[PDB]
Amino acid sequence: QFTDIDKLAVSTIRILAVDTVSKANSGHPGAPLGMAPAAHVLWSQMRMNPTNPDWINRDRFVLSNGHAVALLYSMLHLTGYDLSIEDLKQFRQLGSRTPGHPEFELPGVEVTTGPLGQGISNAVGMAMAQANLAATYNKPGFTLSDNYTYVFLGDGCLQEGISSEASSLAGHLKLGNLIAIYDDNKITIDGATSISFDEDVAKRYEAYGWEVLYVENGNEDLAGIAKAIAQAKLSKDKPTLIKMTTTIGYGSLHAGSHSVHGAPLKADDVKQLKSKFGFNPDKSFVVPQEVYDHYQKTILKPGVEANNKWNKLFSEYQKKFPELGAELARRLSGQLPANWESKLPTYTAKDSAVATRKLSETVLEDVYNQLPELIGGSADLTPSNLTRWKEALDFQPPSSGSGNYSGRYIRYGIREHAMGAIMNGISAFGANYKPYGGTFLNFVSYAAGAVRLSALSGHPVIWVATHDSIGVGEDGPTHQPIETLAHFRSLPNIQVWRPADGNEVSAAYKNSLESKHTPSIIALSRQNLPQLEGSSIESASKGGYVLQDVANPDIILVATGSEVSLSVEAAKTLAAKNIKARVVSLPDFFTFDKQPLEYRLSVLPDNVPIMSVEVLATTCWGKYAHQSFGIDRFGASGKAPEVFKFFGFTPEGVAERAQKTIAFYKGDKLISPLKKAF
Amino acid sequence: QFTDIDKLAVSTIRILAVDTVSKANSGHPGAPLGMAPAAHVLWSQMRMNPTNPDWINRDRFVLSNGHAVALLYSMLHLTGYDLSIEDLKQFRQLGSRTPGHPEFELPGVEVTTGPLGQGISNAVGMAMAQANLAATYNKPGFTLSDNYTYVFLGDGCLQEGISSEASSLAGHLKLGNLIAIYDDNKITIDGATSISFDEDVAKRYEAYGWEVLYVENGNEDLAGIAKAIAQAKLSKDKPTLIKMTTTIGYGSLHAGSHSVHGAPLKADDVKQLKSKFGFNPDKSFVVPQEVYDHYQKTILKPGVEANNKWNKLFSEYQKKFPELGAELARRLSGQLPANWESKLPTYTAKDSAVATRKLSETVLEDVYNQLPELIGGSADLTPSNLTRWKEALDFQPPSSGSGNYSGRYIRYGIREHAMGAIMNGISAFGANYKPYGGTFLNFVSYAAGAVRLSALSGHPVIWVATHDSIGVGEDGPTHQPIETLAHFRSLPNIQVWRPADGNEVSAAYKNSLESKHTPSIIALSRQNLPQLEGSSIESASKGGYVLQDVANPDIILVATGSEVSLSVEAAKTLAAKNIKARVVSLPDFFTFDKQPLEYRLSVLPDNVPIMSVEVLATTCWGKYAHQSFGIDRFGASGKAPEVFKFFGFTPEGVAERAQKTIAFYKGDKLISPLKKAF
Ligand SMILES: Cc1ncc(C[n+]2csc(CCOP(=O)(O)OP(=O)(O)O)c2C)c(N)n1
Ligand SMILES: Cc1ncc(C[n+]2csc(CCOP(=O)(O)OP(=O)(O)O)c2C)c(N)n1
Ligand SMILES: O=C[C@H](O)[C@H](O)COP(=O)(O)O
Ligand SMILES: O=C[C@H](O)[C@H](O)COP(=O)(O)O
Ligand SMILES: [Ca+2]
Ligand SMILES: [Ca+2]
């Protein structure tokens, strides 16, 4: 039941968002103007505590079409979050809390968006995480988890393949608490949708297993939008898409035109809009008291009240179920179980040679019972990635017979990019979720859109990237990574681990799991690598360390992954010719760089030529080495041992190159590459 | 109408592909065994000349599910292409002509596949190119172009978002000559499809505007498969999907199990299969004469004859229409119009400051009529990328009213990955097609799956990547590239141009268009950059050159794109303090690296500190510079001038750093970074 105040509220939102775009003289006025009625209706009906944006059982809202931020920021201020008019007045300004696109970092903003297709897929992960939480802690009498996941999306999000991957998955999993409202406005940047997007979205979504509702008058039908959302909530075993038709830039003189998509409305156009809406065309950033009063009563106070009930029920739960309550309390506090690192495996050079890919599996089998917040999966490569623990139950709808929602292993299908985004949503949900997904290192590139966002936002997700090099073999160049690590090591805020043996894999996993704001990629071998004499979790945890030392080395050999052993071998060959080579291992650039200069300079000193060894791109090595032995061309289809020989990665092949580096520099004074002038 | 021979032929294919996988003890036997009847039926009705795999009007076949390559190689041998039994016997072996996955490089292999989702999308580009060629050259009496584009795909292909993007577009464009046959076998690596893929593919396809035919018995209904393909050929205004049901590993003792997906069948299982099909279980790579005789008759001879008529028609055409015939002859010969580079714009420092994004547009306007093979487009950013020439007609179905198939501007929609693959297909088609597409540099990453393949196969496609840095401004970090160029400069075989002014944009375009085996990415600014005194097409064309020189420089400043001018300004500030700085411009790592050592060492010599300047990742600069001034962290939402200042990129900010580099090295003898020891 809506009244004049609801209508007063809707104009305040449209005008506030417009004022905000115009003051910055940069921005997107269109969608905010067309989606305002939907926001009012939706937010009014959401269970959230603006004073605790962290409440675990809060209804969650994702703005997939991020360019419409002015709408998100307006709502945040009006409903009582930590966002003032002053903040809105510095929208898009260097240093403001109001950047051009929503960032995870701010309270009320659930994930960072801007790149189309990412928010809808993130919301899918958020709903999977809810389904899991509820199935794991809910007990009769204690419904600790039951929140909904709402999303706003545009034609752009529906055009990007990633949202298709996620919607396919979403429908298979039968995520009925996921409700998406689609801004069907018929406009995108180039112009009208018919110019390149004339497909039947409704029919495509039903094919996924989704429910589709329609709202023909999204510009004014508040009760219609209200009914569509309500019916949507009855869809228990089907996620819902509400195709709501609106007019881009509603109220504007150029409404319905793509000119109102991404430019501040012209001043006179703004004046007429205000007037039309009963506002003084001469004043800006005006919020009628009646609107603050309305949201206070409809949202803020009932939400606070709900958060309070939730806390009492939870305290009762901790009384009735001490083990579960303690666990949920801990996950909610964001701590990992005490001394969990104790269950991590350690080795000696006495043990057998294992593919780092299998050592990884061993780790999983060892910590899965220690970490109930660990939820894994693979994008159709479970047996190649070795990413499933034996006692795992799959995350599937109960009606499948293959598993249930309390399951902790996800079958992603061949959808790397969606996996990347779903993982971000699971991480973004809370309760200390530690998601990881597996694929071949070469195909993580398919997910670069999502991965960059794991780094930008700081979601500590884990990629179990197997088949890291030409060691892959016969599959060939289309499968063998070359530029992969160099790429990811150029991206800020992401660990790119490439462990050499058992001890190094445990360090890769301890640092990745202990991480709170940095995602990770663990590049694992297909082939067998031996256990090194000199490795350790403590030393590998530093990102880089001296594996084998000599007094007065003639050369320092730095390697990663499968090349550490080869370098160890090359050093034996070199010792025979009386050349002393110190061998350094560098499992992670990121972690190593984080160490204090004096440590790093103790591993990579002055006055010693340093040559790196890694069967991938050499373009990133200049920051640690003087000379580099790598592969700057695509691979080959052949038996792995033969492919290595063909590229010169033979012990004596490496030794020859160390000898050439010593000769080349003999007589020169050398500076560690670590040293910078400014 | 099929007979015993057709049935003899299908058994030979199944067994030859199995023999090939077993011999290599590596490979995928499953799909080839279930798809054998379809291939036989399809290839038998394709118009192709095994003797000229380049004939422009040949029906084209793409194996989207590349792992099934044993089937493709079998067909190529049997039908008469340059592939012998000996070649088959070295499948997946180092150096053979039979690698683990199909590579464009081989005759009869239309594009490289392996990464799922790529072949289907490539095939779409091939049909767009066909439709364009026909609408441009066909005249009444002369149907020079009318071939079909066939594709084989699996569940994996349909799960990857890229095939959805492409199928959406394909349906919009109404590409009726594109026929896709789907291997609906219910199995993927992890197991049954129901475990994660239970959507209604048929209904999802109709939603795109495609026609879907069904074939229930793909294991043996030759006539049904034949009917499905025939009916498919009648759908002129709709692309066709034929959901053909089969059993993975048909004939194998483990048929229908995911165990037959990617492992050579067990020896005893191979014996029973051969026996079952009337073959001696003890002999391998056996091709009944009757099989050779059959394909010679039904395919090789008819095809050679078809190619012969085609050539006569064509010669008559060049008589009747001299202009068009000469052009087609030239494009076919793969030459660019003579002295086309004369139309390329040149500038002087007296010209106005323009964003290299606009300078780009200017080039397009100038060479569009010189190059009929130039077909451009944008992924919904036509006005930001400035990718449209004014006299352009859009590539759309005639019934749209917005254009027609002779159009040369494509509206890709928000589908970066599909654009990348569609471009590879248009390039792959022939007739000297020169495709280029635009998007923001930061979003080319969404397309890294296709881009890598442009490099691996050598498709010389062009990416007009605008908004190259924090110069983007207010849009913020989600849009400002940081790791992008460092990533693509680590990928083999791809020019990554970052032109500074008008003259450098012309060299970017000249090198890009003249390229026959190397794709390109032209990173263009949003902001205005002035015309440099010292630039030129000739010098810029070498990838790197001395822009400003001095006798006995105290330092060499190496910059790219927007930073060259800043460096030029920093040098002016340094001159004032009597420090001589030579300023070098590096618009392309790739191009420069291809130059002779002597040239490169003349640009970057010994005994002079070299400091690089570029507002992106510093991780790749150690190959040309001693010290680097770059940005190794995400950007900021603010006015571009302010974001640059904030990051220290001001003239005096750069000058200060040069001064620090000089002091740091004062007294040391320095070696140019270009010098390698091995
Ligand atoms: C991956 C990605 N591709 C492209 C863009 C650039 N972009 C921003 S909004 C938009 C199109 C707008 O489409 P839509 O979702 O319909 O929004 P509306 O115009 O309705 O506001 C584009 C191309 C982007 N930010 N990210
Ligand atoms: C981008 C990408 N990711 C993952 C894979 C690894 N892969 C290859 S085939 C396969 C899927 C099984 O595919 P399908 O097409 O389902 O198989 P078939 O019936 O022939 O077994 C997988 C996961 C791939 N080829 N490409
Ligand atoms: O979505 C819109 C874009 O981010 C923005 O409008 C582009 O502005 P510009 O093309 O002027 O850089
Ligand atoms: O699609 C199949 C994969 O490329 C292959 O079967 C993986 O083999 P592997 O897991 O033994 O490396
Ligand atoms: Ca829209
Ligand atoms: Ca399959």
Side-chain angles (χ1 to χ4, degrees), chain A residues 15-29:
Chain A
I15 300 164
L16 200 55
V18 155
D19 278 332
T20 306
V21 180
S22 301
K23 178 158 197 304
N25 195 232
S26 186
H28 302 75

PDB file of all heavy atoms in Angstrom, chain A residues 15-29:
ATOM      1  N   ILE A  15      16.026  13.115  -7.917  1.00  0.00           N
ATOM      2  CA  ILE A  15      16.670  14.407  -7.946  1.00  0.00           C
ATOM      3  C   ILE A  15      18.013  14.397  -7.232  1.00  0.00           C
ATOM      4  O   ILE A  15      18.955  15.032  -7.693  1.00  0.00           O
ATOM      5  CB  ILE A  15      15.766  15.520  -7.406  1.00  0.00           C
ATOM      6  CG1 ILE A  15      14.499  15.612  -8.263  1.00  0.00           C
ATOM      7  CG2 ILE A  15      16.508  16.842  -7.466  1.00  0.00           C
ATOM      8  CD1 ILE A  15      13.369  16.382  -7.627  1.00  0.00           C
ATOM      9  N   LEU A  16      18.126  13.652  -6.135  1.00  0.00           N
ATOM     10  CA  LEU A  16      19.393  13.604  -5.407  1.00  0.00           C
ATOM     11  C   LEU A  16      20.487  13.025  -6.301  1.00  0.00           C
ATOM     12  O   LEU A  16      21.579  13.584  -6.404  1.00  0.00           O
ATOM     13  CB  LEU A  16      19.259  12.781  -4.125  1.00  0.00           C
ATOM     14  CG  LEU A  16      20.347  13.068  -3.084  1.00  0.00           C
ATOM     15  CD1 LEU A  16      20.402  14.565  -2.735  1.00  0.00           C
ATOM     16  CD2 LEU A  16      20.068  12.235  -1.849  1.00  0.00           C
ATOM     17  N   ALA A  17      20.156  11.938  -6.990  1.00  0.00           N
ATOM     18  CA  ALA A  17      21.082  11.272  -7.899  1.00  0.00           C
ATOM     19  C   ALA A  17      21.465  12.185  -9.068  1.00  0.00           C
ATOM     20  O   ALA A  17      22.608  12.166  -9.532  1.00  0.00           O
ATOM     21  CB  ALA A  17      20.461   9.994  -8.412  1.00  0.00           C
ATOM     22  N   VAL A  18      20.506  12.969  -9.555  1.00  0.00           N
ATOM     23  CA  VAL A  18      20.758  13.897 -10.654  1.00  0.00           C
ATOM     24  C   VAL A  18      21.664  15.026 -10.178  1.00  0.00           C
ATOM     25  O   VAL A  18      22.578  15.437 -10.900  1.00  0.00           O
ATOM     26  CB  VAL A  18      19.442  14.512 -11.202  1.00  0.00           C
ATOM     27  CG1 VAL A  18      19.709  15.860 -11.873  1.00  0.00           C
ATOM     28  CG2 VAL A  18      18.805  13.570 -12.201  1.00  0.00           C
ATOM     29  N   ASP A  19      21.393  15.547  -8.984  1.00  0.00           N
ATOM     30  CA  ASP A  19      22.196  16.635  -8.423  1.00  0.00           C
ATOM     31  C   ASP A  19      23.646  16.223  -8.259  1.00  0.00           C
ATOM     32  O   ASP A  19      24.563  17.018  -8.472  1.00  0.00           O
ATOM     33  CB  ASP A  19      21.658  17.068  -7.062  1.00  0.00           C
ATOM     34  CG  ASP A  19      20.503  18.030  -7.173  1.00  0.00           C
ATOM     35  OD1 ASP A  19      20.433  18.771  -8.174  1.00  0.00           O
ATOM     36  OD2 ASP A  19      19.665  18.052  -6.250  1.00  0.00           O
ATOM     37  N   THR A  20      23.824  14.976  -7.848  1.00  0.00           N
ATOM     38  CA  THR A  20      25.120  14.364  -7.620  1.00  0.00           C
ATOM     39  C   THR A  20      25.914  14.181  -8.925  1.00  0.00           C
ATOM     40  O   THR A  20      27.133  14.357  -8.940  1.00  0.00           O
ATOM     41  CB  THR A  20      24.899  13.014  -6.902  1.00  0.00           C
ATOM     42  OG1 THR A  20      24.108  13.245  -5.729  1.00  0.00           O
ATOM     43  CG2 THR A  20      26.211  12.347  -6.509  1.00  0.00           C
ATOM     44  N   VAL A  21      25.233  13.831 -10.017  1.00  0.00           N
ATOM     45  CA  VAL A  21      25.911  13.649 -11.305  1.00  0.00           C
ATOM     46  C   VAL A  21      26.275  15.003 -11.905  1.00  0.00           C
ATOM     47  O   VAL A  21      27.357  15.182 -12.467  1.00  0.00           O
ATOM     48  CB  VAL A  21      25.035  12.887 -12.319  1.00  0.00           C
ATOM     49  CG1 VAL A  21      25.778  12.724 -13.632  1.00  0.00           C
ATOM     50  CG2 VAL A  21      24.641  11.537 -11.767  1.00  0.00           C
ATOM     51  N   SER A  22      25.361  15.957 -11.803  1.00  0.00           N
ATOM     52  CA  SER A  22      25.605  17.283 -12.332  1.00  0.00           C
ATOM     53  C   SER A  22      26.731  18.020 -11.596  1.00  0.00           C
ATOM     54  O   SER A  22      27.589  18.631 -12.244  1.00  0.00           O
ATOM     55  CB  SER A  22      24.308  18.075 -12.341  1.00  0.00           C
ATOM     56  OG  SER A  22      23.363  17.396 -13.147  1.00  0.00           O
ATOM     57  N   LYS A  23      26.761  17.945 -10.266  1.00  0.00           N
ATOM     58  CA  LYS A  23      27.827  18.613  -9.516  1.00  0.00           C
ATOM     59  C   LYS A  23      29.230  18.114  -9.886  1.00  0.00           C
ATOM     60  O   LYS A  23      30.200  18.877  -9.821  1.00  0.00           O
ATOM     61  CB  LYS A  23      27.635  18.525  -7.994  1.00  0.00           C
ATOM     62  CG  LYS A  23      28.804  19.201  -7.253  1.00  0.00           C
ATOM     63  CD  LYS A  23      28.511  19.645  -5.828  1.00  0.00           C
ATOM     64  CE  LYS A  23      29.571  20.651  -5.341  1.00  0.00           C
ATOM     65  NZ  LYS A  23      30.990  20.174  -5.404  1.00  0.00           N
ATOM     66  N   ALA A  24      29.345  16.839 -10.255  1.00  0.00           N
ATOM     67  CA  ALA A  24      30.638  16.250 -10.631  1.00  0.00           C
ATOM     68  C   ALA A  24      30.943  16.468 -12.110  1.00  0.00           C
ATOM     69  O   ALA A  24      32.082  16.298 -12.551  1.00  0.00           O
ATOM     70  CB  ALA A  24      30.664  14.738 -10.308  1.00  0.00           C
ATOM     71  N   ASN A  25      29.912  16.851 -12.857  1.00  0.00           N
ATOM     72  CA  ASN A  25      30.002  17.079 -14.295  1.00  0.00           C
ATOM     73  C   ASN A  25      30.646  15.865 -14.960  1.00  0.00           C
ATOM     74  O   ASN A  25      31.403  15.966 -15.924  1.00  0.00           O
ATOM     75  CB  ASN A  25      30.752  18.379 -14.606  1.00  0.00           C
ATOM     76  CG  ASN A  25      30.547  18.835 -16.041  1.00  0.00           C
ATOM     77  OD1 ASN A  25      31.506  19.101 -16.758  1.00  0.00           O
ATOM     78  ND2 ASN A  25      29.284  18.928 -16.466  1.00  0.00           N
ATOM     79  N   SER A  26      30.283  14.706 -14.430  1.00  0.00           N
ATOM     80  CA  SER A  26      30.762  13.417 -14.903  1.00  0.00           C
ATOM     81  C   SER A  26      29.786  12.428 -14.295  1.00  0.00           C
ATOM     82  O   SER A  26      29.409  12.567 -13.132  1.00  0.00           O
ATOM     83  CB  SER A  26      32.180  13.136 -14.368  1.00  0.00           C
ATOM     84  OG  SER A  26      32.740  11.941 -14.912  1.00  0.00           O
ATOM     85  N   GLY A  27      29.318  11.463 -15.073  1.00  0.00           N
ATOM     86  CA  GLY A  27      28.406  10.510 -14.484  1.00  0.00           C
ATOM     87  C   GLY A  27      27.284   9.998 -15.347  1.00  0.00           C
ATOM     88  O   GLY A  27      27.053  10.477 -16.451  1.00  0.00           O
ATOM     89  N   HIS A  28      26.550   9.042 -14.790  1.00  0.00           N
ATOM     90  CA  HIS A  28      25.446   8.393 -15.480  1.00  0.00           C
ATOM     91  C   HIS A  28      24.121   8.674 -14.806  1.00  0.00           C
ATOM     92  O   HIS A  28      23.821   8.060 -13.777  1.00  0.00           O
ATOM     93  CB  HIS A  28      25.670   6.888 -15.447  1.00  0.00           C
ATOM     94  CG  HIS A  28      26.954   6.465 -16.074  1.00  0.00           C
ATOM     95  ND1 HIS A  28      28.176   6.645 -15.468  1.00  0.00           N
ATOM     96  CD2 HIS A  28      27.194   5.908 -17.280  1.00  0.00           C
ATOM     97  CE1 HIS A  28      29.127   6.218 -16.294  1.00  0.00           C
ATOM     98  NE2 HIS A  28      28.556   5.778 -17.369  1.00  0.00           N
ATOM     99  N   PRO A  29      23.307   9.579 -15.367  1.00  0.00           N
ATOM    100  CA  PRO A  29      21.994   9.979 -14.850  1.00  0.00           C
ATOM    101  C   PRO A  29      20.826   9.069 -15.250  1.00  0.00           C
ATOM    102  O   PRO A  29      19.868   8.918 -14.491  1.00  0.00           O
ATOM    103  CB  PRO A  29      21.804  11.362 -15.451  1.00  0.00           C
ATOM    104  CG  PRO A  29      22.451  11.220 -16.794  1.00  0.00           C
ATOM    105  CD  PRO A  29      23.719  10.458 -16.483  1.00  0.00           C
TER     106      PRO A  29
END
